[PDB]
């Protein structure tokens, strides 16, 4: 009790996306945009598709470093492009200054930056399964009201720095409420955003020799 509660079942902030600010070699960009997708890894998607409707707010945390695990004093900007705003296109973009895009300036040689994001959706709850069509075959069953906005990251810098910076985005689902429990997935996940499966059905249980064999 209180240990299998639905709140405790989704706690314990875990990795959701490993994005990499490329700035060296053949990728002299210096920025990268990572669209927020809770259903990133399968181990998380299967837990989320347990319920149909879900309402929560997240607490993102960024664990960044260089590739040799050092953390020099480089200065980073993390900008949260809200759902419905334009996303930047290069290192120097007018979008990097729109005061309606919240931004967090934190050096590498600092504790990880942490920011909460509220429940951002027009509906009453996020909806993993949408039996319907928007725009009243590659459009079926895809709800647009689950978008949580983007996260753009750039080094506050003039030219290229020649240092790749790996970033690890961690997320903590707070205040979880869920509705309409569903059967847990049984087949492999063939494709993102679609429940398609393989022609070769795999039994849910492992097959023994006889019905009278233990």
């Amino acid at each position: 009790v209180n240990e299998a509660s639905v709140e405790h079942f989704y706690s314990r902030a875990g990795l959701v996306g490993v994005v990499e600010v490329k700035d060296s070699g053949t990728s002299l960009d210096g920025y990268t945009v990572w669209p927020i997708d809770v259903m990133g890894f399968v181990q998380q998607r299967r837990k989320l598709e347990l319920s149909t409707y879900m309402r929560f707010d997240a607490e993102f945390t960024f664990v960044s470093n260089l590739n040799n695990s050092t953390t020099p004093g480089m200065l980073l900007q993390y900008m949260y492009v809200p759902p419905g705003a334009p996303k930047p296109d290069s290192r120097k973009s007018y979008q990097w200054q729109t005061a309606t895009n919240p931004s967090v300036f934190a050096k590498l040689s600092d504790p990880p930056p942490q920011v909460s994001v509220p429940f951002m959706s027009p509906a009453t709850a996020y909806q993993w399964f949408y039996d319907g069509y928007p725009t009243f075959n590659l459009q079926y069953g895809q709800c647009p009201n689950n978008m949580m906005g983007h996260f753009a990251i750039r080094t506050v810098s003039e030219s290229t720095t020649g240092k790749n910076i790996h970033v690890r985005v961690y997320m903590r689902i707070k205040h979880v409420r869920a509705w309409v429990p569903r059967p847990l997935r049984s087949q492999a996940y063939m494709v993102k955003n679609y429940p398609t499966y393989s022609q070769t059905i795999t039994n849910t249980a492992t097959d023994r020799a006889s019905i009278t064999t233990t």
């Binding site: 509906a123 039996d131 059967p183 847990l184 494709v191 398609t196 393989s198």
Partner: protein, 207 residues
Amino acid sequence: NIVLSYGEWPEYCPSPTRPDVSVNRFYTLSTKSWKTESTGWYWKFPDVLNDTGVFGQNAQFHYLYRSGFCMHVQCNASKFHQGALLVAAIPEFVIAASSPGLYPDFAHTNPGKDGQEFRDPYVLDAGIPLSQALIFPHQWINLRTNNCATIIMPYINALPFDSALNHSNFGLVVIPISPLKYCNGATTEVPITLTIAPLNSEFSGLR
């Protein structure tokens, strides 16, 4: 002996046209033939009535729609027939395709008033395992005991009102678990009849 989906009678949204018993009548759909090798059938809830009668008119001419339902299955077998059906109502029934051609055809996502026969009854055509479909509201049709099953399902959606044609709320599934076997010399195809009756229906935005 009627199952109450999640235990909530359907209620009007407190404050939009509220129709009457002229619309809240019993629509008796066609009867499908439960044969031995038959795999099952499913209907999308609001989609099954979008082209029949006054309810079809209201759905195809208004903009927002919300209604409960009192789906009702009955099957008239003899006392020498044997079998067992599972009828459940699945909210947000998202049919999925089966790649070895990556998304289901419209004839499979909105079958209409005629229903569609399952292609993969084991995995419910949606990857989830049948052995767990009982987590939804359901009733067992076991020929040796009962031959009817009524499910009252209220309105389950994120928004208060939604389009009656673009987004189908839930899906009524009926699958034979124990196949139909019968000795020689009986009506080789038990008939299954599905009666629907909307409840606490509402529309808004005419023409």
